[PDB]
Design a protein around this ligand. Sequence first.
Ligand code: ANP
Ligand code: ANP
Ligand code: CL
Ligand code: K
Ligand code: K
Ligand code: MG
Ligand code: MG
Lengths: 311, 315
Amino acid sequence: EVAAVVVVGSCMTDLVSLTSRLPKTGETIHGHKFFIGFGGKGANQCVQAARLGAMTSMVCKVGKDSFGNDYIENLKQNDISTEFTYQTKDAATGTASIIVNNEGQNIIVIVAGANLLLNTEDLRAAANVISRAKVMVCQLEITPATSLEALTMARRSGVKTLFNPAPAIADLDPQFYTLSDVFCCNESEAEILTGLTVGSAADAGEAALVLLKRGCQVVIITLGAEGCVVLSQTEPEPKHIPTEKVKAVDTTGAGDSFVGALAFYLAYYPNLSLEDMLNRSNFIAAVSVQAAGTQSSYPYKKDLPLTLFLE
Amino acid sequence: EVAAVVVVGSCMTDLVSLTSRLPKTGETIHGHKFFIGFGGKGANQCVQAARLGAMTSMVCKVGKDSFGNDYIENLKQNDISTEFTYQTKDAATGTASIIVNNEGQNIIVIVAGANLLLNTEDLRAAANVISRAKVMVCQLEITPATSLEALTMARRSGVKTLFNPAPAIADLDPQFYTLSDVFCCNESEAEILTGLTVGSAADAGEAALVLLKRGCQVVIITLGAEGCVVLSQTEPEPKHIPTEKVKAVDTTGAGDSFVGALAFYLAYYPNLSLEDMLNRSNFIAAVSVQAAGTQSSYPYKKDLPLTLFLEHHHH
Ligand SMILES: Nc1ncnc2c1ncn2[C@@H]1O[C@H](COP(=O)(O)OP(=O)(O)NP(=O)(O)O)[C@@H](O)[C@H]1O
Ligand SMILES: Nc1ncnc2c1ncn2[C@@H]1O[C@H](COP(=O)(O)OP(=O)(O)NP(=O)(O)O)[C@@H](O)[C@H]1O
Ligand SMILES: [Cl-]
Ligand SMILES: [K+]
Ligand SMILES: [K+]
Ligand SMILES: [Mg+2]
Ligand SMILES: [Mg+2]
């Protein structure tokens, strides 16, 4: 089973406390529910792609701890290759500690942990799998040198690079743009990266063009309920792809659903137009918002309309 | 091997993130370290008593989950009986999500979880062990009704009750006071319970008298570095028991150290005066503040002065 989608990126344990009020400095507050979830942008993306039918491989590092062992089982239960899922005793599995009130306001503390210890030696071991893939997906949740090396390796073998600059930082290494065949981010990330205000699809088109001029081949900005905007070196005029209105239950994880869907279409449906791929990816992400949670909300092929898988 | 000290109360997994600044509403920040620890007032108290040499048993409920299985191992490693450590599939193990900055300031979110599912049926199964104890310790980190049930059972069997109303509730059922042989709380809890300011020993004396009149046999209010204040039905005049000054490294868990030490003394040295017990308990809690962490800071008998273990009054 040759993997067509390789994700080099993060696995994180989500530790979620639900409360009626958020704490201030020095305060202890009592909440009403705690749960553990599997997260991390890399793993989220990988899971969505796998559930659509992709043969995937997750290159990542977790701890030699209960959370790490559980994450490995999570990837296996989602039919993801863990050949290059490493474990280390030198850091805990990455964690996202999330406090959420009943209005959806939150405080989040991320400790990337073992994710940061995925190094270039670890990557090099995956060279053969990377070279045989169709798509390589990376984000900004591991150590930058490792993600840059992954993108470089993909480019050397002609593998399509899908980069999600999330979470965004203002002064991103220029190579992230120049190594990206497809660069996909949300409005708030676009603002951080470009310094422009993005309040509309037109505004997103202006931000996208800055990103394009930094060296990306294709730029997509997701707009939540307003769909997405795309432009490319060959077609630099922005195109707004809207999505039909749905009643959202929980929008958490929608961006990773979108990126994982796009990876699937890039790998398995390469002759579809970009606009068609984005229409389908918008639809799948909009399914995800109609269920609670992150990975638990990501739809399987069997539960989706047949027309999403016709060519 | 009869358990002399039975703690009916909470176990909580501490989920700790270390950061350079504490976040406010709406913020996402990155920290530099995450680790898991063991907490919960009931388990903390039980651990300190066990380390002093008590035969203890923890009546508690955790989840049928990794955190719960780990907690059971923690109690076993501290030589605590786990015969009444229940598990449930109906809720996660209780959690304390803790964010700490480089100066040691924190924000905490507690989700009681499986602790709230410790129920009447569980207490009935524990009834024989409760009834045969010397001291039954409880707090307010389980369902209040379950703590009240445990106090009731202990009282009916003539077992000494040590009640720590923590965290405090302003409209606590009157029976909590009348079922409490020893009622022990800190300044902030005393303020909630009495509606007085409690900052000083004098303040604590005034608050303690309000509590005593509600039906407690003995009231103790702890004062951090200033020791504690005690009064009783037999001796209603407040006595301030000071503690010798130490260099505090980390005061987390000191209150639970104090209560676990007091439970040990009530069970194994019942002949001693309150003042004697409290001097010793103050000293043990002050040892705990000289080391990092919560349970890991609690001293063992073998590492403490011999004078703490004499059967008779000491100067
Ligand atoms: N309320 C919504 N209704 C319909 N589709 C939605 C809604 N919110 C999000 N989506 C879809 O999900 C995609 C991604 O949402 P968006 O909020 O831009 O992602 P994000 O902020 O990157 N989230 P994430 O990366 O998982 O943390 C959008 O382009 C839509 O296709
Ligand atoms: N800085 C300190 N120096 C010396 N002894 C201390 C200090 N802080 C606390 N103690 C001892 O610890 C006891 C209890 O401390 P206190 O701060 O009153 O507990 P609490 O606030 O109920 N803590 P906890 O219940 O564990 O969260 C005091 O009576 C002292 O004996
Ligand atoms: Cl880290
Ligand atoms: K969702
Ligand atoms: K300590
Ligand atoms: Mg996103
Ligand atoms: Mg206390």
